[PDB]
Amino acid sequence: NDKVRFIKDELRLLQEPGSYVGEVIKIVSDKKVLVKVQPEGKYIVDVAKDI
């Protein structure tokens, strides 16, 4: 049943947009991290409550 539920829910999760690979060039502060995302430029990203 767990397998079946996971397979049924997988269809929705695939349509959720993916995620870019980032590169932590420099740490800015306690909640902002400078990240250079390939291959265009860099950004000031927000860390989740886990990391």
Partner: protein
């Protein structure tokens, strides 16, 4: 006293038999719907 215990054990057994037949039928239909969902996705 003892008769109540016998009847309670009989009721527990009968409910458990219901549970076993339920679980077997659900196993078969979970196989079916797993194949169907694998195909649908």
């Amino acid at each position: 006293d003892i008769y109540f215990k016998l009847k309670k054990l009989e009721k527990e057994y009968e409910l458990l038999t219901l549970q076993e037949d339920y679980i077997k039928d659900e196993q078969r239909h979970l196989k079916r719907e797993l194949k169907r969902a694998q195909e649908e996705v």
